[PDB]
Design a protein around this nucleic acid. Structure first.
Ligand SMILES: [K+]
Ligand SMILES: [K+]
Ligand SMILES: [K+]
Ligand SMILES: [K+]
Ligand SMILES: [K+]
Ligand SMILES: [K+]
Ligand SMILES: [K+]
Ligand SMILES: [K+]
Ligand SMILES: [K+]
Ligand SMILES: [K+]
Ligand SMILES: [K+]
Ligand SMILES: [K+]
Ligand SMILES: [K+]
Ligand SMILES: [Mg+2]
Ligand SMILES: [Mg+2]
Ligand SMILES: [Mg+2]
Ligand SMILES: [Mg+2]
Ligand SMILES: [Mg+2]
Ligand SMILES: [Mg+2]
Ligand SMILES: [Mg+2]
Ligand SMILES: [Mg+2]
Ligand SMILES: [Mg+2]
Ligand SMILES: [Mg+2]
Ligand SMILES: [Mg+2]
Ligand SMILES: [Mg+2]
Ligand SMILES: [Mg+2]
Ligand SMILES: [Mg+2]
Ligand SMILES: [Mg+2]
Ligand SMILES: [Mg+2]
Ligand SMILES: [Mg+2]
Ligand SMILES: [Mg+2]
Ligand SMILES: [Mg+2]
Ligand SMILES: [Mg+2]
Ligand SMILES: [Mg+2]
Ligand SMILES: [Mg+2]
Ligand SMILES: [Mg+2]
Ligand SMILES: [Mg+2]
Ligand SMILES: [Mg+2]
Ligand SMILES: [Mg+2]
Ligand SMILES: [Mg+2]
Ligand SMILES: [Mg+2]
Ligand SMILES: [Mg+2]
Ligand SMILES: [Mg+2]
Ligand SMILES: [Mg+2]
Ligand SMILES: [Mg+2]
Ligand SMILES: [Mg+2]
Ligand SMILES: [Mg+2]
Ligand SMILES: [Mg+2]
Ligand SMILES: [Mg+2]
Ligand SMILES: [Mg+2]
Ligand SMILES: [Mg+2]
Ligand SMILES: [Mg+2]
Ligand SMILES: [Mg+2]
Ligand SMILES: [Mg+2]
Ligand SMILES: [Mg+2]
Ligand SMILES: [Mg+2]
Ligand SMILES: [Mg+2]
Ligand SMILES: [Mg+2]
Ligand SMILES: [Mg+2]
Ligand SMILES: [Zn+2]
Lengths: 118, 101, 50, 84, 60
RNA sequence: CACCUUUGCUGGCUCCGGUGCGCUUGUGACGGCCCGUGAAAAUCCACAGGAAGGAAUAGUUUUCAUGCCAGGUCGUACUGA
RNA sequence: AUCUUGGUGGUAGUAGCAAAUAUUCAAAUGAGAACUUUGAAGACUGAAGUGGGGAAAGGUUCCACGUCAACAGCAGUUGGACGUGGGUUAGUCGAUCCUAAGAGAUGGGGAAGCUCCGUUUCAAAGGCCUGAUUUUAUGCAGGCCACCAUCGAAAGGGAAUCCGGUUAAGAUUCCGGAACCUGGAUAUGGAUUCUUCACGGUAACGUAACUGAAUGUGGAGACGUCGGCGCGAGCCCUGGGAG
RNA sequence: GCGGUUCUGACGUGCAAAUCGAUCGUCGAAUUUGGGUAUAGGGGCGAAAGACUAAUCGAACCAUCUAGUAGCUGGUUCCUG
RNA sequence: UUGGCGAGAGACCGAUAGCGAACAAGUACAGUGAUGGAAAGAUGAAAAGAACUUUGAAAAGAGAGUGAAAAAGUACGUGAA
RNA sequence: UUGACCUCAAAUCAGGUAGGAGUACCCGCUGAACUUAAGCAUAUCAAUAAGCGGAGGAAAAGAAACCAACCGGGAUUGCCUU
RNA sequence: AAACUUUCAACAACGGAUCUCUUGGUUCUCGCAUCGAUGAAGAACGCAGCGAAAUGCGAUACGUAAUGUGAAUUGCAGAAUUCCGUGAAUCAUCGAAUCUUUGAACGCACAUUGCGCCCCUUGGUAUUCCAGGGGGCAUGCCUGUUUGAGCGUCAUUU
């Protein structure tokens, strides 16, 4: 059938590591059997289980690190948002919104007015 | 016309000097205190053929004044200098064949 | 070529694996138009040029 | 002697495989690829050789990262995850 | 006789065989085959029998 | 002696010389030749020096012997007409 | 349009398939044999070989099993063909290390610029030794020397391996036996010492060992070519004997 | 071994876009040659023939400017009146 | 705005045309290299792709059959010269 | 002696940033000849091709050291005109 | 007279024109603005039960996670038909990951799968040797930190 990642997300770090090894053992066993038999398609299910478990392990370990840098200025580049190189170099909303005191005063004194012709 | 033979020489490709077998450049010692003010004695260790050159060279060994070590110079041998001969170089060296005054 | 680089040997290994006729079952596939292996190479016909 | 007999003497390579572009165009003695220009930082190309530009440009390979960018741009470089 | 990762050296093969099959290795000889995979010829020490261990891992 | 045996099994002998402007090749000590006098570097050793350390009821010494452990990576088929 | 691409004729079953001395008989196999296999015979290369190995180059052509549509300018049961598999084992052989002619970063200087020069320079250009401290394998304790990256040889330089056996196809690589080198660790014997760092020999020098930092000096690495002479090895020739 | 004189031999829709046979030059050096390495196009290299520089040389090869220009050659497609 | 992404269209071309490329095309292949660079679309509604018999060593033939049609048999629409 | 200052360095020092690609259009630099002139040199082709540097969704330009000579207009760009 | 040659027709060849077709091209219009040291474009090598390609992907390898759909995939094999479901699929979507060796390509090199050094850790009697695992070491430039250099230079104190 295969493992299901919603079931794995309940599990602990150690339980998952243990399961990962049981799958790696199982996969080896089938690689041997494949030599004898003509066709052996069960091996696909266990390849994908391994890949599932590693995905979940990595998710857990990353979310742990996201918590460790909660709120801190500077976090690992791999947890920073990707966007694009050019977007990451752009001025922030704050920087782009800055006006000098001279211009702030003019903007208050003389905003564009709403008006209509009759 | 094409570039003539005498103009090809300056690029120095196939016309460079064949220096594999040469002993080193023949040169007097660097002019230092000892030579300006007194003399320094060296020994002629070897007299040796240099490829490309007519004249033989003389490997003269002098002590270093400032460090405990020997310093081989390469002189062009004057007629009459012999292995084992001492050579005197400096302001106060005597007027004998092989000395540097 | 007895004493060969790894990089050359790796390319030769690739060439070994590719040297085969088309698997017959491809011909049965729905809407198949591949008749034969059109990129087959042979040591007597065409050189690899490394 | 300049023809058939002289073709017998051809067994040394002027060019080997280029690490950068994979072609057999790395000139061994110049240590320089005649096709892509490795190890110059820039990739060799010329506007006199349009057909050669077309053989190597963006799109002639896998893309790998650049194929997904349009999709990412379409969804406003969103960050989180889909909710249920 | 095993197929073995192309990245694997003789130290890592010795260590893997001891770990996976609980056996003692005398020497490892390796070659890269013409199809570009790596084959290892792993001689066991005299205390172990290759046919037993091969029967356990289950190819006869 | 065994016998379309795994392929056996058993026994015996496997010794002593000569020769040379011989051939091929290695090498030694020499000789001839040059307005030609016929690489470099890694690497290894020795020496000079005398820093420093070292005994008596115990100190020194692994350039003597013996003993323990390890030696990765890539090439390796075949042709060479 | 000696037009462009494609197709097709006559020529024509014609030119031709004549270099490298050469084939023959039988059996087997097979639908089929001038050409495959075995046997018998006749010849050839004739060791500066048509033999046995390699370098460049090729890249699986190697080997087996199956097997003949195409290809082997006749043939084909055969094949370097076709299909499917098998096959290359290293501390000691190479690469890897070193430098050669040379190539080439950096410091700098040119050039609108792609880049060019130059290779130790008109640069503040590093990295070892030893004890410890027992705080630790970094600052500290001392010292020490400072040249100038790097790449460049499968024929140059260079640590160390041999025999016998073994496969369809691998072997100085596997197996068996017997060695060796480098790096590491290390304690037992021997040696040395109360004249502390050995003795002997007139001497050339001997020996199982027999303290030795910095620094310095030597050596080896390390070298043309030809000629005759000497000596060794393998081969050749030859006697007796046992098969 | 290196060369290439003569036959103006073979061949001349070849064995071959330079070969084959015989004959011949040279054969211990201004010798032959492998690999590495340097020199690049108005440039190189040349014991000099305008030779050689990948079957290309009295200026290589590749792409582009370029559908370069042509008072010159060739062609220029249905019928009748 | 002869590129990229997403759309809509045409008195445009219809496999020697139209992009070089309607197809595993910048592919196969050539070249030491820069570069150069093709050919190649159409069974049928559906594989229903010819069981079985017979001649032949076999390829195949002759029958039988499938199909609306094999004057559609993969050497596949039509099928000119 | 202790502490400044100036200038200049070093660090795998803390945090960043540049390079390469694409290149239709855009901002510069550099820069031909074929060709035309019935020859050819100035001229033309062309302030073009090729080469090099640098950007963006646009770029550049832009609020007059402007145009005018009128009864004066009023940043830049683009179209129709001239 | 036949053969032969020539001409025409029928049937059969050769060959692939013609006709009909068209998931391709071409041109015009409209809208949009998004590559890269957070490692791009491009390259190499790999990965499927049975693939040589094309296409997809990276040792988690024709994919993993997430979300939507709601039962396929299909050449065969196999699996499944609680399929009235946290659930089929070479499905769509895609925000989380994985992402070999490379490449601007960054420890140094590269016709080498060549050679280093540093930190943490494990094993082998181990600070120093060998091995395994993890993580690092390019250049120019800016701001800052720290440690310094120069009779450039001030004060202070010998
Ligand atoms: K010729
Ligand atoms: K080795
Ligand atoms: K060597
Ligand atoms: K030598
Ligand atoms: K001599
Ligand atoms: K000139
Ligand atoms: K050429
Ligand atoms: K020219
Ligand atoms: K005229
Ligand atoms: K075409
Ligand atoms: K039909
Ligand atoms: K930086
Ligand atoms: K269209
Ligand atoms: Mg090629
Ligand atoms: Mg020529
Ligand atoms: Mg040659
Ligand atoms: Mg060359
Ligand atoms: Mg090996
Ligand atoms: Mg000899
Ligand atoms: Mg061999
Ligand atoms: Mg051989
Ligand atoms: Mg031979
Ligand atoms: Mg005839
Ligand atoms: Mg003839
Ligand atoms: Mg015969
Ligand atoms: Mg004869
Ligand atoms: Mg004979
Ligand atoms: Mg064979
Ligand atoms: Mg034939
Ligand atoms: Mg035949
Ligand atoms: Mg075969
Ligand atoms: Mg060796
Ligand atoms: Mg340079
Ligand atoms: Mg080297
Ligand atoms: Mg050697
Ligand atoms: Mg063999
Ligand atoms: Mg052995
Ligand atoms: Mg001749
Ligand atoms: Mg003649
Ligand atoms: Mg004739
Ligand atoms: Mg003349
Ligand atoms: Mg025209
Ligand atoms: Mg023209
Ligand atoms: Mg076309
Ligand atoms: Mg019909
Ligand atoms: Mg038809
Ligand atoms: Mg006709
Ligand atoms: Mg830092
Ligand atoms: Mg023109
Ligand atoms: Mg004119
Ligand atoms: Mg004219
Ligand atoms: Mg003119
Ligand atoms: Mg331009
Ligand atoms: Mg942009
Ligand atoms: Mg706009
Ligand atoms: Mg602007
Ligand atoms: Mg103003
Ligand atoms: Mg205005
Ligand atoms: Mg990556
Ligand atoms: Zn390249």
């Amino acid at each position: 059938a295969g493992v299901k990642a919603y079931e794995l997300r309940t599990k602990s770090k150690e339980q998952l590591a243990s399961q990962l090894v049981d799958l790696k053992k199982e996969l080896a066993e089938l690689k041997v059997q494949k030599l004898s038999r003509p066709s052996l398609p069960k091996i696909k299910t266990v390849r994908k289980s391994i890949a599932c478990v590693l995905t979940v392990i990595n998710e857990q370990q990353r979310e742990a690190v996201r918590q460790l840098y909660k709120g801190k200025k500077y976090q690992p580049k791999d947890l920073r948002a990707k966007k694009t190189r050019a977007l990451r170099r752009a001025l922030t909303k704050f920087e782009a919104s800055q006006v000098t005191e001279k211009q702030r005063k003019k903007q208050i004194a003389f905003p564009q007015r709403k008006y209509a012709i009759k | 016309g094409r570039v003539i033979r005498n103009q090809r020489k300056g690029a120095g490709s196939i016309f460079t000097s064949h220096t594999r077998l040469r002993q080193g450049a023949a040169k007097l010692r660097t002019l230092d205190y000892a030579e300006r003010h007194g003399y320094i004695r060296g020994i002629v260790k070897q007299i040796v053929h240099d490829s490309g050159r007519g004249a033989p060279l003389a490997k003269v060994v002098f002590r270093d004044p400032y460090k405990y070590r020997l310093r081989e110079e390469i002189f062009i041998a004057n007629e009459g200098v012999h292995t084992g001969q001492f050579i005197y170089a400096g302001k106060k060296a005597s007027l004998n064949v092989g000395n540097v005054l | 070529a007895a004493q060969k680089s790894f990089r050359i040997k790796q390319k030769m290994a690739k060439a070994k694996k590719q040297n085969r006729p088309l698997p017959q079952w491809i011909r049965l596939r729905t809407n198949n138009t591949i008749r034969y292996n059109a990129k087959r190479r042979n040591w007597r016909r065409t050189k690899m040029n490394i | 002697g300049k023809g058939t007999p002289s073709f017998g003497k051809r067994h040394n390579k002027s060019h080997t495989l280029c690490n950068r572009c994979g072609r057999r165009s790395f000139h061994v003695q110049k240590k320089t690829c005649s096709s892509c220009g490795y190890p110059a930082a820039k990739t060799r190309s010329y506007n006199w050789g349009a057909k050669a530009k077309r053989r190597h440009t963006t799109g002639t390979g896998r893309m790998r990262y650049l194929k997904h960018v349009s999709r990412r741009f379409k969804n406003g470089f969103q960050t989180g995850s889909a909710s249920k | 006789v095993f197929q073995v990762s192309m990245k694997a050296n003789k130290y890592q093969i010795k260590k893997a065989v001891k770990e996976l099959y609980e056996v003692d290795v005398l020497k490892v000889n390796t070659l890269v085959r013409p199809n570009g995979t790596k084959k290892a010829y792993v001689r066991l020490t005299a205390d172990y029998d290759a046919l037993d261990i091969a029967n356990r891992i289950g190819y006869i």
